[PDB]
Amino acid sequence: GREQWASRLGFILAAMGSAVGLGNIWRFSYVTGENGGAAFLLVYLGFIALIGIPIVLAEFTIGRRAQSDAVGSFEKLAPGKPWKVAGLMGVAAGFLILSFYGVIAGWILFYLFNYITGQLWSAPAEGFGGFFEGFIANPTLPLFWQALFMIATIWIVAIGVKKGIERSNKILMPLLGVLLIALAIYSLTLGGAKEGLAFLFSPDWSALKDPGVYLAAISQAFFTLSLGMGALITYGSYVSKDSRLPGAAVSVAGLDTAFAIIAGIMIFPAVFALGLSPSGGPGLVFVVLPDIFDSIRLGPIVGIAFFILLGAAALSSAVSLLEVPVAYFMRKFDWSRKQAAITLGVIITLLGIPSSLSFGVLGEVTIIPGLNIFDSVDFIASSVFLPLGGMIIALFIGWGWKTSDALAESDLTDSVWGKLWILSLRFIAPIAILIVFLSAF
């Protein structure tokens, strides 16, 4: 009685919907900014090609072969073997990541509400930066918008794969991309393009002699690809033998990278035209974008379109995050989909609440030494659980599978590409991750 994608394009568009969201605009911007731009970018692009694409194909393959959740897939394919630690850790990463993802997405709804009610058309007296700061440090206001976003997320997951997840509006992601392209072109004309483009594309290798940069690059590569937690195993598990995995993996990574690159071309020349520091941290785009819209005559209209379209993208990504614990709990405890979605969704919302508060009244609390609550949850989930899970997933196919199976189940043959793929999983990817972990600690 397991669900399957009803439509032929269902799978690839769902995988794409999962990947493209806040990580491409909000996260990519502030992480690229605080790590120095171009050298970080190049390391990130390297990781996408050589680690991301293979491990994406790996998740797809595992999931389609087992037709089960992130944990169940490992149990089914290799019962009594330790590999399932990856999926157990992924379920946990799912709780953690969605708990703060819903907070940032709630910031998005707040901004959308303000544009719609005419509030952010001109600069507030305290300025766009002052407006943002006052919002997020408010103890309760961000929580209301967060709860609102999670309700929407819970509802789609409760509805089902076919009736909910698959039924996204197909025009919204391509509209977001076009708007991003148009906005990138516009910020190129604002006066900071020479400096913003040099920050973004002209490497300074001095930054690379910090091992923190490599780990930030790999974390962002996993995060943006919806990777390492079994989210793509899960989506893959709803897929029939009528699907071509390698093409999907490449398309997902290519398109996700296009979005991030254009987002960067929008943001950094804008950062530089405004005189701001690119190291501004998580609120970077919430401070920059409204400034950019304000300089356009029809800018309030652009603002409405942007926050709507990014909101829809954050929504499809959030749904894929919630789908991981939901799928697992449905199987493991015979919970109904609606019951799992509501229960886990509320729990994850509440878990999210101290991360929201860390931007204000809890700003001085640490968990991991020196890191506030938000930064700690993100570090653990994105920089520890995701790359480790990815490593185990890579080793699993690479060393725990017969090669003929690995290739057949992934729609590859023992050609140059199949060989390249297998080499990635056995050695390149898991060793690069190992070396990043060892060096960064």
Ligand X SMILES: N[C@@H](Cc1c[nH]c2ccccc12)C(=O)O
Ligand Y SMILES: CCCCCCCCCO[C@@H]1O[C@H](CO)[C@@H](O)[C@H](O)[C@H]1O
Ligand Z SMILES: CCCCCCCCCCCCO[C@H]1O[C@H](CO)[C@@H](O[C@H]2O[C@H](CO)[C@@H](O)[C@H](O)[C@H]2O)[C@H](O)[C@H]1O
The binding site for ligand Z (CB under 6 A) comprises: 109, 112-113, 131, 134-135, 138, 141, 148
Interaction between residue 234 and Na ion (CB under 5 A): no
**Pick 58 or 120: Cβ nearer ligand X:** 58
186 forms part of the interface with ligand Y (CB under 6 A): yes
434 part of the interface to ligand Y, by CB under 6 A = no
Return d(Cα 25, Cα 292) in angstroms, integer: 15
| Contact status: 14 vs ligand X (CB under 6 A) | no
Distance CA 17, CA 351 (A): 24
- Shortest Cβ 144–ligand Z spacing (Å): 7
Under the criterion CB under 6 A, does residue 182 sit at the interface with ligand Y? yes
Among 5, 18, 60, 345, binds ligand X (CB under 6 A): 18
From 200-208, 249-257, 369-377, 402-410, span contacting ligand Y (CB under 6 A): 200-208
By the rule CB under 5 A, 313 interacts with Na ion: yes
Question: Which range in 18-26, 197-205, 239-247, 368-376 contacts ligand X by CB under 6 A?
Answer: 18-26
Q: State in angstroms the smallest separation of the CB of 144 from ligand Y.
A: 30
Shortest distance, position 134 Cβ to ligand Z, whole Å = 4
The residue from 9, 194, 250, 279 that contacts ligand Y (CB under 6 A) is 194
Q: Which does 112 bind (CB under 5 to 8 A by kind): ligand X, Na ion, ligand Z, none?
A: ligand Z
**Least distance in Å: CB of 224 to ligand X?**
4
Identify residues 270-329 at the interface with ligand Y (CB under 6 A).
Answer: 295-298, 302
Residue 302 binding target from Na ion, ligand X, ligand Y, none, CB below 5 to 8 Å by type: ligand Y
Contact call for residue 189 and ligand Y (CB under 6 A): yes
Task: Give the footprint of ligand X on this chain (CB under 6 A).
Answer: 18-19, 21-24, 97, 223-224, 226, 229, 231, 317, 320-321
